Amino acid sequence: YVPDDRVLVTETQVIRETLWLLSGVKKLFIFQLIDGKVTVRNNIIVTHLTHSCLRSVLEQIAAYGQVVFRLQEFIDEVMGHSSTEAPFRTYQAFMWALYKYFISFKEELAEIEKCIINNDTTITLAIVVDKLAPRLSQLKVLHKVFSTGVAEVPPDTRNVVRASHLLNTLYKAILEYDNVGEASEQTVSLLFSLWVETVRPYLQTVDEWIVHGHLWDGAREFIIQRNKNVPVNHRD
Amino acid sequence: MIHELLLALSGYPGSIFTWNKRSGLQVSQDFPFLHPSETSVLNRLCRLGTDYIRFTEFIEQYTGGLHGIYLRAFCTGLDSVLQPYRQALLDLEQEFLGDPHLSISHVNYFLDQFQLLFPSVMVVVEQIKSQKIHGCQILETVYKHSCGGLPPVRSALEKILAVCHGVMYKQLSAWM
Amino acid sequence: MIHELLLALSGYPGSIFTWNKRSGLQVSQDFPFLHPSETSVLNRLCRLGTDYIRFTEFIEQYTGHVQQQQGQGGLHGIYLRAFCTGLDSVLQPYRQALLDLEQEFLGDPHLSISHVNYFLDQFQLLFPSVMVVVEQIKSQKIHGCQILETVYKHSCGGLPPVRSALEKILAVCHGVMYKQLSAWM
Amino acid sequence: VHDPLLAITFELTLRSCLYPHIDKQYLDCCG
Amino acid sequence: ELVKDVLNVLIGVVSATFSLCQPAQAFVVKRGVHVSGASPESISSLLSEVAEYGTCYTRLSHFSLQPVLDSLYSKGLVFQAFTSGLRRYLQYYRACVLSTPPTLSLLTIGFLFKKLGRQLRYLAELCGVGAVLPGTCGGGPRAAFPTGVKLLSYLYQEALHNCSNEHYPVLLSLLKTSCEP
């Protein structure tokens, strides 16, 4: 048999690679991405790990890596980094809440990194993987919500359709997870926070139009499109 | 070996412990490093790991066929019964990191309390799959084995069952 | 690779971070000692420093550079000066954030770049948003009070932090508008 | 106003404490 | 460690320098170029901005320090009042420079003093002397500073021009003192 050349990276370095991947980072030597599909690098070996089991766990992290990468890409697209005065105003609220969640997740990853760098305490792949288990539970639900709200129709031409659809896939999935039980109460709380900080723009538009009496929206965001409001006041 | 196994018992099978649909995690090789008969010990131990992949699959697909909110609650409970089986595989590695002479039989002994909870929860899960007990009759198949008699699996199925009542006490508290 | 980061983000390049006017701040992209994983993180951080340098340049260009000596809204104006005055004060918390970072790095001598990424990730979103606000003024040569509208229309941004940040600037510029109204009226 | 009343399986009922705001606003506005 | 010098570079010292000379030919501030002791180029550049503040302090301090001498025929009584008020400000600026902690971090010193640095550079450019020798042009121009009613009026038009900006209190104080004669 002919042995195959493999990089022989250290197991400790692998957790550092996983941690920066789980935070917003690209072009890591582990988890090489090719077409927006983060995939475990073909040849990595470690001392106290066989190739196959290492591939299996690394792929299992990379599956979550794809979710975090796509959410980061969406956030990047609508952070202002990129028309003339086209504030979507609901996609921005949704990404803002998503960003808050990603900040807290990044804080937990930062604490783990600090523990990894300076101590004699052993942090290995199994320890960290099972330590992030509550966050990993959140990420899959978040991926489903995003993959239905924003990726249902890939061409996604119309804008009022996008806004209504996103609000209506949050209001629906909260009902779906409302009666799963009182077992964790984690998923439902996450989804509810997303809903509140995604409906804030619509209800601001409401309250403004309610008391100040002038409907005020751009990109045809709101559902009662005042397409005919421009000239009708002339008729009396 | 003692890290490949302390991960193969977890989800990730590896080359040594090849996974197969008909039977899961059966290492089948003649190895100089392992003692000849240690495979048999490893087979008995891999029953536990095989079961673990089976539950993990089952929780994955939920949370035409089976569907409901109760399969989104039984599986959440099946995560909690398995939580002390994850922590108890972390602790094994923590001990094995330091002690360099400790052998497989400590894995056997330490993970021997999980050869009573798991086999008799597996019959519950295969019952729920072979018979499409989708709705409120899931409480029946949990309460029918919760009488039990083997205390590890009599309290395990109790943790599972109480969650299902947690769903039923909000479905029948919205109603009342 | 640690203290140099704070220097560059403070907005003065080092040999490791070559400033080119075209590419802003840019890592050399080739050092055998560091693996490519950290490079991308560094570039992401450098985007913020690039925006800070561009901001400081524009501010220096149009505020206090002359004793009021071609006067024109794009070129000069009390409102333009007010915008610069607001921009630097809105950028002040970035200054304070970098300051607290240096204190904590004095406290601890081995801190990963991810920690810096965290503590600065809130400005990572605010700075790009303000960039278009300045960019439209430069491109459209916006004149006089029309800057007030230009910032107001981005006051409907769906980012609450960006909204409050720009609101501060509009308060400052409403300062000068109210001031000119305070003589004629 | 939604958030204060929020801060004190009851999800539809949670939404049911957000409609009386519209009802009051319309009650003042029909006036 | 080197920062102690920089703290006193805010004041006139010799560790860093204000050679009263033609910009960058003999005019100098101590710097390490190419080979240096634990001083990558960026450190020198940061020291260079603090140096800009330092040169402005030294030039402005000379401009105001030069007293009437009791035979100031070229300038006026009102210019003498102007210089007195300016020195009042300079004394306050020196006091803040002193009030800086001796133990402070390298970046933090400059970030702490940014606002006062730009304020002072503006004040320098307000006067011809401070405007002259900016570092981007020689000492040759030597722009004539107005004196008398010309000076008073020039100050007031600058007050109108720069009314709204953060720098206006300084101008108001100078004008209050200057008008008294």
mmCIF file with all atom_site columns, C-alpha atoms in Angstrom, chain C residues 53-146:
data_model
loop_
_atom_site.group_PDB
_atom_site.id
_atom_site.type_symbol
_atom_site.label_atom_id
_atom_site.label_alt_id
_atom_site.label_comp_id
_atom_site.label_asym_id
_atom_site.label_entity_id
_atom_site.label_seq_id
_atom_site.pdbx_PDB_ins_code
_atom_site.Cartn_x
_atom_site.Cartn_y
_atom_site.Cartn_z
_atom_site.occupancy
_atom_site.B_iso_or_equiv
_atom_site.pdbx_formal_charge
_atom_site.auth_seq_id
_atom_site.auth_comp_id
_atom_site.auth_asym_id
_atom_site.auth_atom_id
_atom_site.pdbx_PDB_model_num
ATOM 1  C CA . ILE C 1 53  ? -8.872  56.941 7.262  1.00 0.00 ? 53  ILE C CA 1
ATOM 2  C CA . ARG C 1 54  ? -11.164 58.146 4.472  1.00 0.00 ? 54  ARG C CA 1
ATOM 3  C CA . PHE C 1 55  ? -13.369 59.892 7.050  1.00 0.00 ? 55  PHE C CA 1
ATOM 4  C CA . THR C 1 56  ? -10.444 61.603 8.768  1.00 0.00 ? 56  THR C CA 1
ATOM 5  C CA . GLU C 1 57  ? -9.095  62.726 5.398  1.00 0.00 ? 57  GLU C CA 1
ATOM 6  C CA . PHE C 1 58  ? -12.407 64.240 4.237  1.00 0.00 ? 58  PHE C CA 1
ATOM 7  C CA . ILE C 1 59  ? -12.974 65.925 7.607  1.00 0.00 ? 59  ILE C CA 1
ATOM 8  C CA . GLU C 1 60  ? -9.484  67.462 7.540  1.00 0.00 ? 60  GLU C CA 1
ATOM 9  C CA . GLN C 1 61  ? -10.023 68.550 3.927  1.00 0.00 ? 61  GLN C CA 1
ATOM 10 C CA . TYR C 1 62  ? -13.244 70.492 4.580  1.00 0.00 ? 62  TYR C CA 1
ATOM 11 C CA . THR C 1 63  ? -13.079 71.659 8.258  1.00 0.00 ? 63  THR C CA 1
ATOM 12 C CA . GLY C 1 64  ? -10.691 74.319 9.562  1.00 0.00 ? 64  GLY C CA 1
ATOM 13 C CA . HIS C 1 65  ? -8.395  73.922 6.548  1.00 0.00 ? 65  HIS C CA 1
ATOM 14 C CA . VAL C 1 66  ? -8.797  77.639 5.738  1.00 0.00 ? 66  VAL C CA 1
ATOM 15 C CA . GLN C 1 67  ? -9.970  80.805 7.476  1.00 0.00 ? 67  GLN C CA 1
ATOM 16 C CA . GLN C 1 68  ? -12.915 80.924 5.069  1.00 0.00 ? 68  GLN C CA 1
ATOM 17 C CA . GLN C 1 69  ? -10.332 82.016 2.460  1.00 0.00 ? 69  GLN C CA 1
ATOM 18 C CA . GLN C 1 70  ? -14.624 78.887 -4.527 1.00 0.00 ? 70  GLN C CA 1
ATOM 19 C CA . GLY C 1 71  ? -17.704 78.939 -2.316 1.00 0.00 ? 71  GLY C CA 1
ATOM 20 C CA . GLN C 1 72  ? -20.271 76.345 -3.375 1.00 0.00 ? 72  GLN C CA 1
ATOM 21 C CA . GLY C 1 73  ? -22.277 73.728 -1.444 1.00 0.00 ? 73  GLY C CA 1
ATOM 22 C CA . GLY C 1 74  ? -20.277 70.782 -2.731 1.00 0.00 ? 74  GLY C CA 1
ATOM 23 C CA . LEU C 1 75  ? -17.044 72.694 -2.164 1.00 0.00 ? 75  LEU C CA 1
ATOM 24 C CA . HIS C 1 76  ? -17.788 74.651 1.022  1.00 0.00 ? 76  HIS C CA 1
ATOM 25 C CA . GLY C 1 77  ? -20.586 75.895 3.258  1.00 0.00 ? 77  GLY C CA 1
ATOM 26 C CA . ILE C 1 78  ? -21.647 76.351 6.872  1.00 0.00 ? 78  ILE C CA 1
ATOM 27 C CA . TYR C 1 79  ? -23.826 73.247 6.494  1.00 0.00 ? 79  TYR C CA 1
ATOM 28 C CA . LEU C 1 80  ? -20.906 71.202 5.152  1.00 0.00 ? 80  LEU C CA 1
ATOM 29 C CA . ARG C 1 81  ? -18.813 72.365 8.103  1.00 0.00 ? 81  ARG C CA 1
ATOM 30 C CA . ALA C 1 82  ? -21.641 71.369 10.450 1.00 0.00 ? 82  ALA C CA 1
ATOM 31 C CA . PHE C 1 83  ? -21.741 67.911 8.870  1.00 0.00 ? 83  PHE C CA 1
ATOM 32 C CA . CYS C 1 84  ? -18.002 67.486 9.454  1.00 0.00 ? 84  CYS C CA 1
ATOM 33 C CA . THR C 1 85  ? -18.443 68.652 13.056 1.00 0.00 ? 85  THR C CA 1
ATOM 34 C CA . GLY C 1 86  ? -21.163 66.046 13.544 1.00 0.00 ? 86  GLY C CA 1
ATOM 35 C CA . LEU C 1 87  ? -19.201 63.274 11.824 1.00 0.00 ? 87  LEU C CA 1
ATOM 36 C CA . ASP C 1 88  ? -16.180 63.473 14.113 1.00 0.00 ? 88  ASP C CA 1
ATOM 37 C CA . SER C 1 89  ? -18.318 63.471 17.262 1.00 0.00 ? 89  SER C CA 1
ATOM 38 C CA . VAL C 1 90  ? -20.354 60.521 15.964 1.00 0.00 ? 90  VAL C CA 1
ATOM 39 C CA . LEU C 1 91  ? -17.054 58.710 15.324 1.00 0.00 ? 91  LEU C CA 1
ATOM 40 C CA . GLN C 1 92  ? -15.847 59.414 18.897 1.00 0.00 ? 92  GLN C CA 1
ATOM 41 C CA . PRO C 1 93  ? -17.143 56.096 20.393 1.00 0.00 ? 93  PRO C CA 1
ATOM 42 C CA . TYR C 1 94  ? -14.915 54.199 17.934 1.00 0.00 ? 94  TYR C CA 1
ATOM 43 C CA . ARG C 1 95  ? -12.002 56.121 19.419 1.00 0.00 ? 95  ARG C CA 1
ATOM 44 C CA . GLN C 1 96  ? -13.086 55.182 22.945 1.00 0.00 ? 96  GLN C CA 1
ATOM 45 C CA . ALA C 1 97  ? -13.604 51.535 21.946 1.00 0.00 ? 97  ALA C CA 1
ATOM 46 C CA . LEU C 1 98  ? -10.076 51.240 20.566 1.00 0.00 ? 98  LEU C CA 1
ATOM 47 C CA . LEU C 1 99  ? -8.828  52.909 23.759 1.00 0.00 ? 99  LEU C CA 1
ATOM 48 C CA . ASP C 1 100 ? -10.490 50.349 26.015 1.00 0.00 ? 100 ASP C CA 1
ATOM 49 C CA . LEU C 1 101 ? -9.063  47.594 23.821 1.00 0.00 ? 101 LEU C CA 1
ATOM 50 C CA . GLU C 1 102 ? -5.511  48.858 24.403 1.00 0.00 ? 102 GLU C CA 1
ATOM 51 C CA . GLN C 1 103 ? -6.144  48.939 28.166 1.00 0.00 ? 103 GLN C CA 1
ATOM 52 C CA . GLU C 1 104 ? -7.306  45.330 28.173 1.00 0.00 ? 104 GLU C CA 1
ATOM 53 C CA . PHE C 1 105 ? -4.308  44.292 26.029 1.00 0.00 ? 105 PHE C CA 1
ATOM 54 C CA . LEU C 1 106 ? -2.075  45.963 28.608 1.00 0.00 ? 106 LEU C CA 1
ATOM 55 C CA . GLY C 1 107 ? -3.889  43.758 31.101 1.00 0.00 ? 107 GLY C CA 1
ATOM 56 C CA . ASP C 1 108 ? -3.323  40.529 29.092 1.00 0.00 ? 108 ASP C CA 1
ATOM 57 C CA . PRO C 1 109 ? -0.325  39.811 26.782 1.00 0.00 ? 109 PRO C CA 1
ATOM 58 C CA . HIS C 1 110 ? -1.902  37.076 24.550 1.00 0.00 ? 110 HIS C CA 1
ATOM 59 C CA . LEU C 1 111 ? -5.253  37.939 22.981 1.00 0.00 ? 111 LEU C CA 1
ATOM 60 C CA . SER C 1 112 ? -6.642  36.476 19.769 1.00 0.00 ? 112 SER C CA 1
ATOM 61 C CA . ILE C 1 113 ? -7.746  38.613 16.835 1.00 0.00 ? 113 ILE C CA 1
ATOM 62 C CA . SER C 1 114 ? -11.261 37.178 17.251 1.00 0.00 ? 114 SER C CA 1
ATOM 63 C CA . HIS C 1 115 ? -11.577 39.156 20.496 1.00 0.00 ? 115 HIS C CA 1
ATOM 64 C CA . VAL C 1 116 ? -10.817 42.379 18.615 1.00 0.00 ? 116 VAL C CA 1
ATOM 65 C CA . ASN C 1 117 ? -13.288 41.302 15.924 1.00 0.00 ? 117 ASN C CA 1
ATOM 66 C CA . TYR C 1 118 ? -15.970 40.961 18.596 1.00 0.00 ? 118 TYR C CA 1
ATOM 67 C CA . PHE C 1 119 ? -15.415 44.175 20.481 1.00 0.00 ? 119 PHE C CA 1
ATOM 68 C CA . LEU C 1 120 ? -15.279 46.160 17.211 1.00 0.00 ? 120 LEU C CA 1
ATOM 69 C CA . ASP C 1 121 ? -18.042 44.291 15.333 1.00 0.00 ? 121 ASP C CA 1
ATOM 70 C CA . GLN C 1 122 ? -20.705 46.866 16.255 1.00 0.00 ? 122 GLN C CA 1
ATOM 71 C CA . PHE C 1 123 ? -18.945 49.589 14.250 1.00 0.00 ? 123 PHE C CA 1
ATOM 72 C CA . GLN C 1 124 ? -18.338 47.125 11.378 1.00 0.00 ? 124 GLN C CA 1
ATOM 73 C CA . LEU C 1 125 ? -21.989 47.787 10.449 1.00 0.00 ? 125 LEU C CA 1
ATOM 74 C CA . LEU C 1 126 ? -22.309 51.485 11.301 1.00 0.00 ? 126 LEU C CA 1
ATOM 75 C CA . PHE C 1 127 ? -19.336 52.773 9.273  1.00 0.00 ? 127 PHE C CA 1
ATOM 76 C CA . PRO C 1 128 ? -20.463 51.418 5.837  1.00 0.00 ? 128 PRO C CA 1
ATOM 77 C CA . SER C 1 129 ? -23.902 52.947 6.419  1.00 0.00 ? 129 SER C CA 1
ATOM 78 C CA . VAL C 1 130 ? -22.453 56.429 6.994  1.00 0.00 ? 130 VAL C CA 1
ATOM 79 C CA . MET C 1 131 ? -20.229 55.996 3.917  1.00 0.00 ? 131 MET C CA 1
ATOM 80 C CA . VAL C 1 132 ? -23.128 56.335 1.471  1.00 0.00 ? 132 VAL C CA 1
ATOM 81 C CA . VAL C 1 133 ? -24.371 59.407 3.364  1.00 0.00 ? 133 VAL C CA 1
ATOM 82 C CA . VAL C 1 134 ? -21.076 61.164 2.663  1.00 0.00 ? 134 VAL C CA 1
ATOM 83 C CA . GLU C 1 135 ? -20.793 59.656 -0.829 1.00 0.00 ? 135 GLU C CA 1
ATOM 84 C CA . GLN C 1 136 ? -24.078 61.059 -2.138 1.00 0.00 ? 136 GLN C CA 1
ATOM 85 C CA . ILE C 1 137 ? -23.095 64.538 -0.953 1.00 0.00 ? 137 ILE C CA 1
ATOM 86 C CA . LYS C 1 138 ? -19.798 64.313 -2.838 1.00 0.00 ? 138 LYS C CA 1
ATOM 87 C CA . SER C 1 139 ? -21.295 62.799 -5.993 1.00 0.00 ? 139 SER C CA 1
ATOM 88 C CA . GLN C 1 140 ? -24.396 64.995 -6.307 1.00 0.00 ? 140 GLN C CA 1
ATOM 89 C CA . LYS C 1 141 ? -22.624 68.204 -5.160 1.00 0.00 ? 141 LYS C CA 1
ATOM 90 C CA . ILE C 1 142 ? -25.503 68.653 -2.723 1.00 0.00 ? 142 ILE C CA 1
ATOM 91 C CA . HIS C 1 143 ? -26.017 72.316 -1.879 1.00 0.00 ? 143 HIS C CA 1
ATOM 92 C CA . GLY C 1 144 ? -27.022 74.055 1.336  1.00 0.00 ? 144 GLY C CA 1
ATOM 93 C CA . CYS C 1 145 ? -30.035 72.681 3.168  1.00 0.00 ? 145 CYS C CA 1
ATOM 94 C CA . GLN C 1 146 ? -30.427 69.790 0.686  1.00 0.00 ? 146 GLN C CA 1
#
